[PDB]
Design a protein around this ligand. Sequence first.
Ligand SMILES: CC(C)CN(C[C@@H](O)[C@H](Cc1cc(F)cc(F)c1)NC(=O)O[C@H]1CO[C@H]2OCC[C@H]21)S(=O)(=O)c1ccc([C@H](C)O)cc1
Lengths: 99, 99
Amino acid sequence: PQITLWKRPLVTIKIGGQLKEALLDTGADDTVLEEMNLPGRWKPKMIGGIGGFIKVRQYDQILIEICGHKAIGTVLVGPTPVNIIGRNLLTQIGCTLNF
Amino acid sequence: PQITLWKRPLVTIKIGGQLKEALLDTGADDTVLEEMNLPGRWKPKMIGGIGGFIKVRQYDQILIEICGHKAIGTVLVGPTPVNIIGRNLLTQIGCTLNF
Ligand SMILES: CC(C)CN(C[C@@H](O)[C@H](Cc1cc(F)cc(F)c1)NC(=O)O[C@H]1CO[C@H]2OCC[C@H]21)S(=O)(=O)c1ccc([C@H](C)O)cc1
């Protein structure tokens, strides 16, 4: 679809069989979700944001459905204030900015 | 134009008479710019993201041109690692997400 920006671009995602709300975030290189139980193996990683760096759990090759568009990529799980869908997955669903 | 998300959506802006590089960020409600000494009155604010909060100075009704598209709104100035163009200005230039 076409998404205007007068409101937050929040969408419903499906990951690990559970539905969640997340923000389409073109300013994020990576996808970062709040604490949740994901299946599979993971490795410790660090990610930096506006306030500094946090420790996260890196899950690779995770199936995630964004508004009915399938993606398979890296998902970082940790103390982010907001579930954000970053460019690593936005590219998979064919998302572009237009003005 | 159309901006793909293979790389950071970095564009040239003009603010306070200066050219800068800034991120078109659908995940940001408001616009946050690197430290710069702007004239006029301002009020202090704390803004939060991954890693915590930073202190910024809120300026109102600031003019910024983003790829030849003029916008005027609130800008937050402080120690951000990147200039962030948020939805408050992305709407004014006609920016949409499309997938
Ligand atoms: C988290 C989100 C809900 C909000 N943020 C936007 C977000 O797009 C941010 C931009 C960004 C920050 C940064 F320090 C470096 C950078 F390159 C990009 N991206 C980000 O943290 O991404 C993470 C994951 O991927 C990595 O790539 C880049 C960093 C890593 S914010 O910046 O906290 C913010 C808060 C409040 C306001 C106003 C007050 O409303 C405006 C902005």
